Amino acid sequence: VLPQALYLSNMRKAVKIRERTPEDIFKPTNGIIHHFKTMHRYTLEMFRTCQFCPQFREIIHKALIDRNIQATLESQKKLNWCREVRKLVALKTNGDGNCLMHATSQYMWGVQDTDLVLRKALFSTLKETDTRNFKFRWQLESLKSQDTRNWNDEWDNLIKMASTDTQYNSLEEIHIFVLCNILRRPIIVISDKLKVGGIYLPLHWPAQECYRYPIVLGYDSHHFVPLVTLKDPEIRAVPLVFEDLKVHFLTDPENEMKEKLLKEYLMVIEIPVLNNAAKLDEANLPKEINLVDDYFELVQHEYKKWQE
Protein backbone atom coordinates (compact mmCIF):
# COMPACT_ATOMS: atom_id res chain seq x y z
CA VAL A 1 0.00 0.00 0.00
CA LEU A 2 2.94 2.38 0.73
CA PRO A 3 5.19 2.84 -2.36
CA GLN A 4 8.71 1.37 -2.72
CA ALA A 5 10.62 4.64 -3.31
CA LEU A 6 10.40 8.21 -1.97
CA TYR A 7 9.84 9.68 -5.44
CA LEU A 8 6.71 7.63 -6.21
CA SER A 9 4.86 9.71 -3.56
CA ASN A 10 4.81 12.67 -5.98
CA MET A 11 5.99 11.73 -9.46
CA ARG A 12 5.16 15.23 -10.72
CA LYS A 13 7.55 16.75 -8.17
CA ALA A 14 10.26 14.20 -8.99
CA VAL A 15 9.91 15.18 -12.69
CA LYS A 16 10.38 18.87 -11.70
CA ILE A 17 13.60 17.95 -9.86
CA ARG A 18 14.87 15.84 -12.77
CA GLU A 19 14.15 18.69 -15.21
CA ARG A 20 16.09 21.17 -13.06
CA THR A 21 19.15 18.81 -12.87
CA PRO A 22 20.56 19.20 -16.44
CA GLU A 23 20.13 23.01 -16.59
CA ASP A 24 22.21 23.35 -13.42
CA ILE A 25 25.29 21.70 -15.01
CA PHE A 26 27.80 24.29 -16.19
CA LYS A 27 30.09 23.22 -19.04
CA PRO A 28 33.29 25.33 -19.17
CA THR A 29 34.89 25.88 -22.60
CA ASN A 30 38.53 25.92 -21.34
CA GLY A 31 38.85 22.32 -20.15
CA ILE A 32 37.76 22.85 -16.51
CA ILE A 33 35.52 19.84 -15.81
CA HIS A 34 31.74 20.38 -16.00
CA HIS A 35 29.97 20.80 -12.67
CA PHE A 36 26.76 21.58 -10.82
CA LYS A 37 26.20 25.26 -10.01
CA THR A 38 23.70 24.86 -7.11
CA MET A 39 22.08 21.45 -6.71
CA HIS A 40 25.17 19.69 -5.32
CA ARG A 41 24.49 21.59 -2.06
CA TYR A 42 21.26 19.70 -1.35
CA THR A 43 20.97 16.90 1.17
CA LEU A 44 18.09 14.59 2.07
CA GLU A 45 17.14 13.26 5.51
CA MET A 46 14.59 10.59 6.25
CA PHE A 47 11.61 11.39 8.48
CA ARG A 48 11.43 10.05 12.05
CA THR A 49 9.90 6.59 12.32
CA CYS A 50 10.12 5.79 16.07
CA GLN A 51 6.78 7.47 16.98
CA PHE A 52 4.94 4.74 14.99
CA CYS A 53 4.15 1.47 16.80
CA PRO A 54 6.77 -1.25 16.05
CA GLN A 55 4.59 -3.33 13.71
CA PHE A 56 3.73 -0.32 11.47
CA ARG A 57 7.34 0.96 11.70
CA GLU A 58 8.21 -2.39 10.10
CA ILE A 59 5.83 -1.70 7.16
CA ILE A 60 7.68 1.59 6.40
CA HIS A 61 11.12 -0.02 6.62
CA LYS A 62 10.17 -2.93 4.34
CA ALA A 63 8.86 -0.31 1.83
CA LEU A 64 11.73 2.24 1.79
CA ILE A 65 14.80 0.70 3.42
CA ASP A 66 17.27 -1.78 1.91
CA ARG A 67 17.35 -4.17 4.88
CA ASN A 68 19.89 -6.61 3.31
CA ILE A 69 22.67 -4.04 2.98
CA GLN A 70 21.65 -2.36 6.28
CA ALA A 71 22.16 -5.71 8.10
CA THR A 72 25.38 -6.72 6.32
CA LEU A 73 27.04 -3.38 7.20
CA GLU A 74 25.74 -3.20 10.80
CA SER A 75 26.74 -6.84 11.58
CA GLN A 76 30.29 -6.21 10.29
CA LYS A 77 30.57 -3.06 12.49
CA LYS A 78 31.19 -0.76 9.45
CA LEU A 79 27.82 1.02 9.85
CA ASN A 80 26.24 2.40 13.07
CA TRP A 81 28.90 1.01 15.39
CA CYS A 82 29.50 4.39 17.07
CA ARG A 83 26.87 5.14 19.74
CA GLU A 84 27.72 8.90 19.87
CA VAL A 85 26.82 9.61 16.19
CA ARG A 86 23.38 9.56 14.52
CA LYS A 87 21.97 6.42 12.92
CA LEU A 88 22.34 6.15 9.14
CA VAL A 89 19.79 4.32 7.04
CA ALA A 90 20.09 2.67 3.62
CA LEU A 91 17.41 3.57 1.04
CA LYS A 92 16.59 1.17 -1.79
CA THR A 93 18.19 1.79 -5.14
CA ASN A 94 17.79 0.13 -8.60
CA GLY A 95 20.39 -2.44 -9.67
CA ASP A 96 20.04 -1.58 -13.39
CA GLY A 97 23.81 -0.85 -13.88
CA ASN A 98 23.58 2.85 -12.90
CA CYS A 99 23.27 2.37 -9.13
CA LEU A 100 26.22 4.63 -8.28
CA MET A 101 24.29 7.47 -9.88
CA HIS A 102 20.92 6.36 -8.48
CA ALA A 103 22.47 6.27 -5.00
CA THR A 104 24.29 9.60 -5.27
CA SER A 105 21.20 11.21 -6.87
CA GLN A 106 18.91 9.93 -4.11
CA TYR A 107 21.28 11.18 -1.40
CA MET A 108 21.08 14.79 -2.67
CA TRP A 109 17.58 15.10 -4.25
CA GLY A 110 15.47 12.02 -3.35
CA VAL A 111 15.18 10.86 -6.95
CA GLN A 112 17.11 8.26 -8.90
CA ASP A 113 19.04 8.96 -12.13
CA THR A 114 16.16 7.77 -14.33
CA ASP A 115 16.98 10.30 -17.11
CA LEU A 116 20.72 9.43 -17.02
CA VAL A 117 21.68 13.06 -16.36
CA LEU A 118 24.44 12.18 -13.84
CA ARG A 119 25.54 9.16 -15.87
CA LYS A 120 25.77 11.28 -19.09
CA ALA A 121 27.55 14.09 -17.22
CA LEU A 122 30.24 11.57 -16.19
CA PHE A 123 30.64 10.27 -19.71
CA SER A 124 30.54 13.75 -21.25
CA THR A 125 33.28 14.90 -18.83
CA LEU A 126 35.55 11.96 -19.65
CA LYS A 127 35.06 12.37 -23.45
CA GLU A 128 35.19 16.22 -23.66
CA THR A 129 37.46 17.50 -20.84
CA ASP A 130 41.14 17.00 -20.13
CA THR A 131 41.54 13.68 -18.34
CA ARG A 132 45.36 13.66 -18.21
CA ASN A 133 45.46 14.10 -14.44
CA PHE A 134 42.66 11.54 -13.79
CA LYS A 135 44.56 8.99 -15.85
CA PHE A 136 47.72 9.71 -13.86
CA ARG A 137 46.00 9.36 -10.49
CA TRP A 138 44.35 6.13 -11.63
CA GLN A 139 47.66 4.61 -12.89
CA LEU A 140 49.35 5.47 -9.61
CA GLU A 141 46.63 3.80 -7.43
CA SER A 142 46.64 0.75 -9.77
CA LEU A 143 50.37 0.27 -9.53
CA LYS A 144 50.19 0.42 -5.68
CA SER A 145 48.07 -2.83 -5.72
CA GLN A 146 50.64 -4.79 -7.85
CA ASP A 147 55.95 -1.99 -17.33
CA THR A 148 53.86 -1.79 -20.53
CA ARG A 149 51.61 0.22 -22.94
CA ASN A 150 48.58 -1.81 -21.82
CA TRP A 151 47.72 1.11 -19.45
CA ASN A 152 46.32 3.20 -22.32
CA ASP A 153 43.68 0.60 -23.36
CA GLU A 154 42.37 -0.04 -19.83
CA TRP A 155 41.88 3.74 -19.57
CA ASP A 156 39.93 3.95 -22.85
CA ASN A 157 37.87 1.00 -21.57
CA LEU A 158 37.08 2.90 -18.34
CA ILE A 159 35.79 5.82 -20.46
CA LYS A 160 33.61 3.41 -22.47
CA MET A 161 32.19 1.97 -19.19
CA ALA A 162 30.95 5.50 -18.31
CA SER A 163 28.73 5.61 -21.44
CA THR A 164 25.11 4.44 -21.73
CA ASP A 165 25.49 1.24 -23.77
CA THR A 166 25.17 -2.34 -22.24
CA GLN A 167 21.11 -2.37 -18.89
CA TYR A 168 24.33 -0.32 -18.26
CA ASN A 169 28.00 -1.08 -17.56
CA SER A 170 29.01 -1.05 -13.88
CA LEU A 171 31.26 1.76 -12.60
CA GLU A 172 34.49 1.35 -10.59
CA GLU A 173 36.51 3.61 -8.17
CA ILE A 174 37.88 6.12 -10.70
CA HIS A 175 34.34 7.04 -11.81
CA ILE A 176 33.39 7.82 -8.21
CA PHE A 177 36.42 10.10 -8.03
CA VAL A 178 35.50 11.87 -11.27
CA LEU A 179 31.93 12.16 -10.01
CA CYS A 180 32.88 14.00 -6.82
CA ASN A 181 34.80 16.51 -8.94
CA ILE A 182 31.60 17.00 -11.03
CA LEU A 183 29.68 17.57 -7.78
CA ARG A 184 32.43 19.58 -6.06
CA ARG A 185 31.47 17.51 -3.04
CA PRO A 186 33.24 14.58 -1.36
CA ILE A 187 31.85 11.04 -1.32
CA ILE A 188 32.35 8.48 1.44
CA VAL A 189 31.63 4.84 0.66
CA ILE A 190 31.24 2.46 3.58
CA SER A 191 31.84 -1.24 2.84
CA ASP A 192 33.20 -4.66 3.83
CA LYS A 193 36.81 -5.79 3.34
CA LEU A 194 35.62 -4.32 -2.32
CA LYS A 195 38.43 -1.77 -2.53
CA VAL A 196 35.60 0.77 -3.36
CA GLY A 197 35.29 1.72 0.33
CA GLY A 198 36.87 5.03 1.35
CA ILE A 199 36.87 8.82 0.84
CA TYR A 200 36.79 10.54 -2.53
CA LEU A 201 37.73 14.24 -2.27
CA PRO A 202 37.25 16.76 -5.14
CA LEU A 203 40.97 17.47 -5.47
CA HIS A 204 40.73 19.23 -8.88
CA TRP A 205 38.93 21.97 -6.99
CA PRO A 206 40.23 24.17 -4.19
CA ALA A 207 38.38 23.29 -0.98
CA GLN A 208 36.91 26.79 -0.68
CA GLU A 209 34.91 26.20 -3.91
CA CYS A 210 33.47 22.84 -2.77
CA TYR A 211 30.63 21.74 -0.50
CA ARG A 212 32.16 20.48 2.76
CA TYR A 213 29.49 17.92 3.69
CA PRO A 214 29.95 14.43 2.28
CA ILE A 215 27.67 12.18 0.30
CA VAL A 216 27.59 8.92 2.22
CA LEU A 217 26.97 5.78 0.25
CA GLY A 218 26.89 2.16 1.40
CA TYR A 219 28.25 -0.60 -0.82
CA ASP A 220 27.95 -4.42 -0.85
CA SER A 221 27.79 -7.12 -3.57
CA HIS A 222 28.25 -4.77 -6.51
CA HIS A 223 25.45 -2.47 -5.19
CA PHE A 224 25.44 1.18 -4.07
CA VAL A 225 22.88 2.75 -1.77
CA PRO A 226 22.60 6.14 -0.05
CA LEU A 227 23.12 6.16 3.72
CA VAL A 228 20.97 9.03 4.88
CA THR A 229 20.42 10.47 8.37
CA LEU A 230 17.08 10.53 10.25
CA LYS A 231 15.46 13.74 11.54
CA ASP A 232 15.30 13.32 15.39
CA PRO A 233 21.31 14.56 21.20
CA GLU A 234 23.80 12.43 19.15
CA ILE A 235 26.05 14.36 16.74
CA ARG A 236 25.28 14.52 13.01
CA ALA A 237 28.51 12.99 11.68
CA VAL A 238 30.11 10.01 9.92
CA PRO A 239 33.18 8.32 11.45
CA LEU A 240 36.35 8.48 9.35
CA VAL A 241 37.73 5.32 11.09
CA PHE A 242 40.78 2.11 15.19
CA GLU A 243 42.04 2.31 11.57
CA ASP A 244 41.58 5.23 9.12
CA LEU A 245 39.37 4.98 6.02
CA LYS A 246 41.23 4.77 2.70
CA VAL A 247 41.57 8.14 0.93
CA HIS A 248 41.60 7.48 -2.82
CA PHE A 249 43.70 8.63 -5.80
CA LEU A 250 46.17 10.74 -3.86
CA THR A 251 49.58 11.72 -5.25
CA ASP A 252 52.49 11.22 -2.80
CA PRO A 253 52.61 14.96 -1.95
CA GLU A 254 48.92 14.91 -1.06
CA ASN A 255 49.37 11.56 0.70
CA GLU A 256 51.84 13.19 3.15
CA MET A 257 49.36 16.04 4.00
CA LYS A 258 46.40 13.59 4.18
CA GLU A 259 44.98 14.78 7.53
CA LYS A 260 45.13 18.46 6.41
CA LEU A 261 43.30 17.59 3.18
CA LEU A 262 40.54 15.96 5.17
CA LYS A 263 40.29 19.13 7.29
CA GLU A 264 40.12 21.27 4.14
CA TYR A 265 37.52 19.27 2.22
CA LEU A 266 35.33 17.95 5.07
CA MET A 267 34.48 19.47 8.44
CA VAL A 268 36.40 17.28 10.86
CA ILE A 269 35.48 16.91 14.54
CA GLU A 270 36.80 14.50 17.18
CA ILE A 271 34.21 12.17 18.79
CA PRO A 272 34.07 10.92 22.42
CA VAL A 273 33.58 7.41 23.84
CA LEU A 274 40.60 10.12 19.82
CA ASN A 275 39.00 9.25 16.45
CA ASN A 276 37.84 11.77 13.81
CA ALA A 277 34.44 12.17 12.09
CA ALA A 278 33.01 14.36 9.26
CA LYS A 279 29.96 16.57 9.91
CA LEU A 280 26.86 15.65 7.90
CA ASP A 281 24.56 18.16 6.27
CA GLU A 282 21.08 18.95 7.61
CA ALA A 283 18.01 18.51 5.38
CA ASN A 284 17.93 21.72 3.34
CA LEU A 285 15.73 20.72 0.37
CA PRO A 286 13.03 23.40 -0.01
CA LYS A 287 9.41 22.26 0.06
CA GLU A 288 8.96 22.72 -3.71
CA ILE A 289 11.51 19.87 -4.21
CA ASN A 290 11.24 17.90 -0.92
CA LEU A 291 9.87 14.43 -1.66
CA VAL A 292 10.31 13.32 1.97
CA ASP A 293 7.56 15.62 3.33
CA ASP A 294 5.20 14.21 0.66
CA TYR A 295 6.01 10.58 1.54
CA PHE A 296 5.52 11.37 5.25
CA GLU A 297 1.99 12.57 4.53
CA LEU A 298 1.07 9.29 2.83
CA VAL A 299 2.44 7.52 5.92
CA GLN A 300 0.48 9.73 8.34
CA HIS A 301 -2.71 9.12 6.34
CA GLU A 302 -2.09 5.36 6.10
CA TYR A 303 -1.34 5.21 9.87
CA LYS A 304 -4.72 6.67 10.91
CA LYS A 305 -6.30 3.91 8.79
CA TRP A 306 -3.98 1.24 10.21
CA GLN A 307 -5.14 2.18 13.72
CA GLU A 308 -8.49 0.43 14.48
Added chain:
Amino acid sequence: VLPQALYLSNMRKAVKIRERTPEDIFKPTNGIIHHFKTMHRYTLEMFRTCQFCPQFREIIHKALIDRNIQATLESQKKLNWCREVRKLVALKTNGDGNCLMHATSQYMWGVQDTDLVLRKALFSTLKETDTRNFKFRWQLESLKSQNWNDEWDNLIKMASTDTLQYNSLEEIHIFVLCNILRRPIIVISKVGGIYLPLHWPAQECYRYPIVLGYDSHHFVPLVTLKDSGPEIRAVPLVNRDRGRFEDLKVHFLTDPENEMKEKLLKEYLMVIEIPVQGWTTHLNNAAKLDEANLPKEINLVDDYFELVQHEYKKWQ
Protein backbone atom coordinates in the same frame (compact mmCIF):
# COMPACT_ATOMS: atom_id res chain seq x y z
CA VAL B 1 7.01 4.29 -17.81
CA LEU B 2 3.61 6.06 -17.43
CA PRO B 3 1.42 5.04 -14.45
CA GLN B 4 -1.92 3.17 -14.77
CA ALA B 5 -4.10 5.69 -12.88
CA LEU B 6 -4.37 9.49 -12.76
CA TYR B 7 -3.83 9.52 -8.98
CA LEU B 8 -0.45 7.76 -9.05
CA SER B 9 1.02 10.90 -10.70
CA ASN B 10 0.86 12.68 -7.32
CA MET B 11 -0.10 10.37 -4.47
CA ARG B 12 0.35 13.19 -1.96
CA LYS B 13 -2.30 15.24 -3.76
CA ALA B 14 -4.66 12.26 -4.03
CA VAL B 15 -4.30 11.79 -0.24
CA LYS B 16 -5.25 15.49 0.24
CA ILE B 17 -8.38 14.95 -1.86
CA ARG B 18 -9.31 11.76 0.00
CA GLU B 19 -8.85 13.53 3.35
CA ARG B 20 -11.08 16.43 2.29
CA THR B 21 -13.90 14.02 1.17
CA PRO B 22 -15.28 12.92 4.60
CA GLU B 23 -15.04 16.43 6.18
CA ASP B 24 -17.24 17.79 3.37
CA ILE B 25 -20.13 15.42 4.20
CA PHE B 26 -22.76 17.28 6.21
CA LYS B 27 -24.93 15.20 8.55
CA PRO B 28 -28.22 17.00 9.23
CA THR B 29 -29.90 16.89 12.64
CA ASN B 30 -33.45 17.20 11.16
CA GLY B 31 -33.60 13.98 9.15
CA ILE B 32 -32.47 15.33 5.75
CA ILE B 33 -30.17 12.73 4.10
CA HIS B 34 -26.42 13.39 4.67
CA HIS B 35 -24.77 15.06 1.70
CA PHE B 36 -21.68 16.76 0.27
CA LYS B 37 -21.45 20.52 0.90
CA THR B 38 -19.02 21.42 -1.94
CA MET B 39 -17.19 18.51 -3.55
CA HIS B 40 -20.16 17.16 -5.52
CA ARG B 41 -19.73 20.22 -7.80
CA TYR B 42 -16.37 19.05 -9.13
CA THR B 43 -15.92 17.48 -12.53
CA LEU B 44 -12.84 15.97 -14.18
CA GLU B 45 -11.85 16.16 -17.86
CA MET B 46 -9.10 14.27 -19.61
CA PHE B 47 -6.28 16.20 -21.31
CA ARG B 48 -6.04 16.35 -25.12
CA THR B 49 -4.10 13.48 -26.66
CA CYS B 50 -4.31 14.14 -30.44
CA GLN B 51 -1.20 16.40 -30.55
CA PHE B 52 0.97 13.34 -29.72
CA CYS B 53 2.07 11.09 -32.60
CA PRO B 54 -0.25 8.04 -32.97
CA GLN B 55 2.18 5.47 -31.55
CA PHE B 56 2.77 7.48 -28.32
CA ARG B 57 -0.96 8.37 -28.12
CA GLU B 58 -1.47 4.59 -27.93
CA ILE B 59 0.88 4.35 -24.90
CA ILE B 60 -1.29 6.90 -22.99
CA HIS B 61 -4.57 5.16 -23.88
CA LYS B 62 -3.30 1.72 -22.86
CA ALA B 63 -2.20 3.29 -19.52
CA LEU B 64 -5.31 5.30 -18.56
CA ILE B 65 -8.25 4.20 -20.71
CA ASP B 66 -10.42 1.06 -20.32
CA ARG B 67 -10.38 0.06 -24.01
CA ASN B 68 -12.63 -3.06 -23.57
CA ILE B 69 -15.63 -1.14 -22.27
CA GLN B 70 -14.90 1.79 -24.61
CA ALA B 71 -15.15 -0.60 -27.61
CA THR B 72 -18.20 -2.55 -26.39
CA LEU B 73 -20.20 0.68 -25.89
CA GLU B 74 -19.06 2.39 -29.12
CA SER B 75 -19.73 -0.73 -31.28
CA GLN B 76 -23.27 -1.03 -29.87
CA LYS B 77 -23.94 2.67 -30.66
CA LYS B 78 -24.68 3.57 -26.99
CA LEU B 79 -21.51 5.69 -26.65
CA ASN B 80 -20.17 8.35 -29.07
CA TRP B 81 -22.75 7.70 -31.77
CA CYS B 82 -23.72 11.39 -32.03
CA ARG B 83 -21.35 13.40 -34.25
CA GLU B 84 -22.56 16.78 -32.85
CA VAL B 85 -21.49 16.14 -29.22
CA ARG B 86 -18.03 15.76 -27.63
CA LYS B 87 -16.28 12.41 -27.35
CA LEU B 88 -16.52 10.65 -23.98
CA VAL B 89 -13.77 8.36 -22.72
CA ALA B 90 -13.77 5.49 -20.20
CA LEU B 91 -11.10 5.58 -17.47
CA LYS B 92 -9.98 2.38 -15.76
CA THR B 93 -11.56 1.47 -12.45
CA ASN B 94 -10.97 -1.35 -9.89
CA GLY B 95 -13.28 -4.37 -9.94
CA ASP B 96 -12.94 -4.97 -6.16
CA GLY B 97 -16.76 -4.86 -5.52
CA ASN B 98 -16.91 -1.07 -4.97
CA CYS B 99 -16.64 -0.03 -8.63
CA LEU B 100 -19.81 2.08 -8.60
CA MET B 101 -18.14 4.26 -5.98
CA HIS B 102 -14.70 4.11 -7.63
CA ALA B 103 -16.30 5.20 -10.91
CA THR B 104 -18.40 8.00 -9.41
CA SER B 105 -15.44 9.15 -7.27
CA GLN B 106 -13.09 9.23 -10.26
CA TYR B 107 -15.64 11.20 -12.33
CA MET B 108 -15.72 14.05 -9.78
CA TRP B 109 -12.22 14.03 -8.18
CA GLY B 110 -9.84 11.73 -10.14
CA VAL B 111 -9.37 9.34 -7.22
CA GLN B 112 -11.06 6.05 -6.43
CA ASP B 113 -13.03 5.30 -3.23
CA THR B 114 -10.04 3.58 -1.60
CA ASP B 115 -11.01 4.82 1.91
CA LEU B 116 -14.66 3.68 1.43
CA VAL B 117 -16.00 7.18 2.19
CA LEU B 118 -18.72 7.05 -0.52
CA ARG B 119 -19.46 3.39 0.17
CA LYS B 120 -19.80 4.05 3.97
CA ALA B 121 -21.93 7.14 3.33
CA LEU B 122 -24.36 4.95 1.34
CA PHE B 123 -24.52 2.30 4.04
CA SER B 124 -24.79 4.84 6.84
CA THR B 125 -27.71 6.53 5.03
CA LEU B 126 -29.61 3.27 4.52
CA LYS B 127 -29.06 2.12 8.16
CA GLU B 128 -29.60 5.46 9.97
CA THR B 129 -32.03 7.61 7.92
CA ASP B 130 -35.68 7.14 7.04
CA THR B 131 -35.79 4.81 4.03
CA ARG B 132 -39.58 4.48 3.80
CA ASN B 133 -39.74 6.46 0.57
CA PHE B 134 -36.73 4.67 -1.02
CA LYS B 135 -38.33 1.31 -0.25
CA PHE B 136 -41.60 2.44 -1.85
CA ARG B 137 -39.89 3.70 -5.00
CA TRP B 138 -37.89 0.47 -5.22
CA GLN B 139 -40.97 -1.79 -4.85
CA LEU B 140 -42.77 0.16 -7.56
CA GLU B 141 -39.89 -0.15 -10.11
CA SER B 142 -39.45 -3.87 -9.20
CA LEU B 143 -43.07 -4.69 -9.82
CA LYS B 144 -42.90 -2.98 -13.28
CA SER B 145 -40.30 -5.61 -14.42
CA GLN B 146 -42.41 -8.66 -13.31
CA ASN B 147 -41.20 -11.37 0.03
CA TRP B 148 -40.59 -7.61 -0.31
CA ASN B 149 -39.35 -6.79 3.21
CA ASP B 150 -36.43 -9.27 3.14
CA GLU B 151 -35.12 -8.30 -0.30
CA TRP B 152 -35.02 -4.71 1.03
CA ASP B 153 -33.07 -5.66 4.18
CA ASN B 154 -30.72 -7.62 1.88
CA LEU B 155 -30.17 -4.50 -0.26
CA ILE B 156 -29.18 -2.57 2.90
CA LYS B 157 -26.73 -5.36 3.82
CA MET B 158 -25.23 -5.23 0.27
CA ALA B 159 -24.35 -1.55 0.89
CA SER B 160 -22.09 -2.46 3.84
CA THR B 161 -18.39 -3.29 3.77
CA ASP B 162 -18.51 -7.04 4.52
CA THR B 163 -17.69 -10.44 2.92
CA LEU B 164 -14.71 -9.49 -4.80
CA GLN B 165 -13.81 -7.97 -1.45
CA TYR B 166 -17.22 -6.18 -1.29
CA ASN B 167 -20.81 -6.94 -2.34
CA SER B 168 -21.88 -5.55 -5.72
CA LEU B 169 -24.38 -2.69 -5.84
CA GLU B 170 -27.60 -2.53 -7.92
CA GLU B 171 -29.90 0.29 -9.23
CA ILE B 172 -31.41 1.45 -5.92
CA HIS B 173 -27.95 2.17 -4.48
CA ILE B 174 -27.18 4.42 -7.47
CA PHE B 175 -30.42 6.28 -6.76
CA VAL B 176 -29.62 6.71 -3.07
CA LEU B 177 -26.08 7.81 -4.08
CA CYS B 178 -27.27 10.66 -6.30
CA ASN B 179 -29.34 11.96 -3.39
CA ILE B 180 -26.17 11.94 -1.24
CA LEU B 181 -24.37 13.86 -4.03
CA ARG B 182 -27.33 16.12 -4.88
CA ARG B 183 -26.28 15.49 -8.45
CA PRO B 184 -27.85 13.26 -11.12
CA ILE B 185 -26.16 10.18 -12.56
CA ILE B 186 -26.48 8.81 -16.07
CA VAL B 187 -25.43 5.23 -16.74
CA ILE B 188 -24.89 4.22 -20.35
CA SER B 189 -25.12 0.48 -21.11
CA LYS B 190 -31.68 -2.52 -16.72
CA VAL B 191 -29.05 -0.42 -14.77
CA GLY B 192 -28.84 1.94 -17.79
CA GLY B 193 -30.69 5.27 -17.42
CA ILE B 194 -31.02 8.51 -15.43
CA TYR B 195 -30.99 8.78 -11.65
CA LEU B 196 -32.26 12.17 -10.41
CA PRO B 197 -31.92 13.41 -6.78
CA LEU B 198 -35.67 13.62 -6.20
CA HIS B 199 -35.46 13.95 -2.38
CA TRP B 200 -33.98 17.36 -3.09
CA PRO B 201 -35.54 20.34 -4.82
CA ALA B 202 -33.73 20.94 -8.12
CA GLN B 203 -32.62 24.42 -6.99
CA GLU B 204 -30.44 22.77 -4.28
CA CYS B 205 -28.78 20.29 -6.68
CA TYR B 206 -25.90 20.41 -9.17
CA ARG B 207 -27.43 20.39 -12.66
CA TYR B 208 -24.57 18.62 -14.51
CA PRO B 209 -24.67 14.83 -14.56
CA ILE B 210 -22.13 12.22 -13.57
CA VAL B 211 -21.80 9.97 -16.59
CA LEU B 212 -20.83 6.38 -15.99
CA GLY B 213 -20.46 3.51 -18.44
CA TYR B 214 -21.48 -0.02 -17.50
CA ASP B 215 -20.83 -3.49 -19.00
CA SER B 216 -20.33 -7.00 -17.54
CA HIS B 217 -20.91 -6.06 -13.93
CA HIS B 218 -18.40 -3.17 -14.18
CA PHE B 219 -18.78 0.61 -13.79
CA VAL B 220 -16.43 3.19 -15.25
CA PRO B 221 -16.52 7.00 -15.51
CA LEU B 222 -17.14 8.41 -18.98
CA VAL B 223 -15.30 11.71 -18.92
CA THR B 224 -14.98 14.45 -21.56
CA LEU B 225 -11.73 15.61 -23.24
CA LYS B 226 -10.36 19.18 -23.11
CA ASP B 227 -10.91 20.26 -26.74
CA SER B 228 -11.20 23.09 -29.24
CA GLY B 229 -14.90 22.65 -30.14
CA PRO B 230 -16.95 23.13 -32.24
CA GLU B 231 -18.94 20.16 -30.85
CA ILE B 232 -21.27 20.75 -27.89
CA ARG B 233 -20.39 19.60 -24.37
CA ALA B 234 -23.39 17.31 -23.77
CA VAL B 235 -24.65 13.74 -23.34
CA PRO B 236 -27.62 12.47 -25.38
CA LEU B 237 -30.71 11.48 -23.40
CA VAL B 238 -31.90 9.18 -26.28
CA ASN B 239 -30.59 5.97 -27.97
CA ARG B 240 -29.96 5.57 -31.72
CA ASP B 241 -30.99 1.99 -30.89
CA ARG B 242 -31.33 -0.26 -33.98
CA GLY B 243 -34.52 1.22 -35.57
CA ARG B 244 -35.83 4.28 -33.75
CA PHE B 245 -34.86 7.17 -31.44
CA GLU B 246 -36.00 6.26 -27.89
CA ASP B 247 -35.74 8.05 -24.50
CA LEU B 248 -33.43 6.81 -21.74
CA LYS B 249 -35.14 5.15 -18.76
CA VAL B 250 -35.63 7.54 -15.81
CA HIS B 251 -35.48 5.46 -12.65
CA PHE B 252 -37.60 5.13 -9.48
CA LEU B 253 -40.30 7.62 -10.42
CA THR B 254 -43.74 7.62 -8.75
CA ASP B 255 -46.66 7.84 -11.24
CA PRO B 256 -47.19 11.59 -10.60
CA GLU B 257 -43.53 12.27 -11.37
CA ASN B 258 -43.68 9.83 -14.29
CA GLU B 259 -46.39 11.99 -15.98
CA MET B 260 -44.21 15.18 -15.64
CA LYS B 261 -41.03 13.29 -16.69
CA GLU B 262 -39.85 15.81 -19.31
CA LYS B 263 -40.25 18.72 -16.84
CA LEU B 264 -38.29 16.81 -14.19
CA LEU B 265 -35.44 16.38 -16.64
CA LYS B 266 -35.57 20.13 -17.36
CA GLU B 267 -35.48 20.88 -13.62
CA TYR B 268 -32.64 18.55 -12.62
CA LEU B 269 -30.45 18.64 -15.77
CA MET B 270 -29.84 21.41 -18.30
CA VAL B 271 -31.60 20.09 -21.37
CA ILE B 272 -30.78 21.33 -24.88
CA GLU B 273 -31.95 20.09 -28.28
CA ILE B 274 -29.27 18.99 -30.80
CA PRO B 275 -29.48 19.35 -34.62
CA VAL B 276 -30.31 15.84 -35.90
CA GLN B 277 -28.59 14.40 -39.05
CA GLY B 278 -31.05 14.39 -42.01
CA TRP B 279 -32.45 17.96 -41.91
CA THR B 280 -39.40 16.01 -41.12
CA THR B 281 -36.05 15.27 -39.32
CA HIS B 282 -35.99 16.93 -35.87
CA LEU B 283 -34.28 17.54 -32.48
CA ASN B 284 -33.75 14.91 -29.76
CA ASN B 285 -32.61 16.13 -26.30
CA ALA B 286 -29.23 16.14 -24.50
CA ALA B 287 -27.92 17.17 -21.03
CA LYS B 288 -25.09 19.73 -20.74
CA LEU B 289 -21.85 18.41 -19.26
CA ASP B 290 -19.74 20.27 -16.77
CA GLU B 291 -16.37 21.82 -17.63
CA ALA B 292 -13.20 20.88 -15.74
CA ASN B 293 -13.39 23.07 -12.64
CA LEU B 294 -11.04 21.27 -10.22
CA PRO B 295 -8.67 23.85 -8.71
CA LYS B 296 -4.95 23.23 -9.12
CA GLU B 297 -4.49 22.18 -5.47
CA ILE B 298 -6.70 19.11 -6.24
CA ASN B 299 -6.28 18.68 -10.03
CA LEU B 300 -4.54 15.35 -10.69
CA VAL B 301 -4.97 15.69 -14.46
CA ASP B 302 -2.54 18.64 -14.78
CA ASP B 303 0.04 16.57 -12.86
CA TYR B 304 -0.40 13.51 -15.09
CA PHE B 305 -0.12 15.71 -18.20
CA GLU B 306 3.27 16.97 -17.04
CA LEU B 307 4.60 13.40 -16.70
CA VAL B 308 3.35 12.80 -20.25
CA GLN B 309 5.01 15.96 -21.59
CA HIS B 310 8.28 14.98 -19.92
CA GLU B 311 8.08 11.36 -21.13
CA TYR B 312 7.27 12.55 -24.69
CA LYS B 313 10.46 14.62 -25.03
CA LYS B 314 12.36 11.45 -24.07
CA TRP B 315 10.28 9.29 -26.43
CA GLN B 316 11.26 11.57 -29.32
